[PDB]
Amino acid sequence: SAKDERAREILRGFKLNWMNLRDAETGKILWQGTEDLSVPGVEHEARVPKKILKCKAVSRELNFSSTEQMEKFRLEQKVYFKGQCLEEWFFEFGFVIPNSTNTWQSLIEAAPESQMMPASVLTGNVIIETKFFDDDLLVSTSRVRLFYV
């Protein structure tokens, strides 16, 4: 109940300003999203360029503002393909200063994958469920359906 109240307070002060996917090697922006993907209760959509799938290393840039302080801001992202969990990502940011705006890049450094699922198969069939936490406090759960265009 106090937990519920604190979570809603954080969420009220929180905005995802933008998300970019970048080519980590060149810094080139491959996709820019400006919808607040952190808002719960709606299915958001992202139309990402199919060329993403052949990019050797993709950094995820999130820029977010928070009126509230957070001790351990972090994300859990579960990627579903046709209802079934394909992969899981966990990204910790850490301590967030009250009234701050922060640019956050995340990279999972791994071997590029030469064998991928077709864009035509992925598109519209991928949902990313993101849980926004401060430590163990769940602030928000959003869903984004991916199209590869």
Of the pair 17, 69, the CB lying nearest ligand FAR is at: 17
| Chain position whose Cβ is nearest to ligand FAR | 130
Element (H, E) at 13: helix 2-13
Phi-psi region of 29 (alpha: psi -120 to 50; beta: other; left: phi over 0): beta
Cα(46)–Cα(86) distance, rounded to whole angstroms?
18
If one asks whether residue 70 binds ligand FAR (CB under 6 A), the answer comes out as no
Q: Is 52 among the residues that bind ligand FAR (CB under 6 A)?
A: yes
Give yes or no for residue 59 binding ligand FAR (CB under 6 A).
Answer: no
Distance CA 90, CA 70 (A): 17
Instruction: State which of residues 14, 38, 66, 139 lies at the interface with ligand FAR (CB under 6 A).
Output: 38
Q: Kindly state whether residue 128 participates in binding ligand FAR, applying the rule CB under 6 A.
A: yes
Looking at 48, 70, 96, 139, which residue binds ligand FAR (CB under 6 A)? 48
User: How long, in residues, is the chain?
Assistant: 149
Residue closer to ligand FAR, measured from CB, 1 or 44 = 44
Q: Specify which residues 81 forms β-bridges with.
A: 84, 126
Q: Considering beta carbons, is residue 66 or 142 the nearer one to ligand FAR?
A: 142
The single residue among 10, 11, 37, 139 that binds ligand FAR, judged by CB under 6 A, is 37
Burial 24-42 (b: 16+ CB within 10 A, else e): beeeeebbebeebbbeeee
Instruction: Find the part of the chain contacting ligand FAR (CB under 6 A) among 4-12, 44-52, 94-102, 105-113.
Output: 44-52
Angle, CA 76 vertex, CA 86 and CA 94 arms, to 5°: 150
**Contact residues for ligand FAR, defined by CB under 6 A:** 19, 21, 37-38, 46, 48, 52, 58, 62, 128, 130, 142, 144, 146
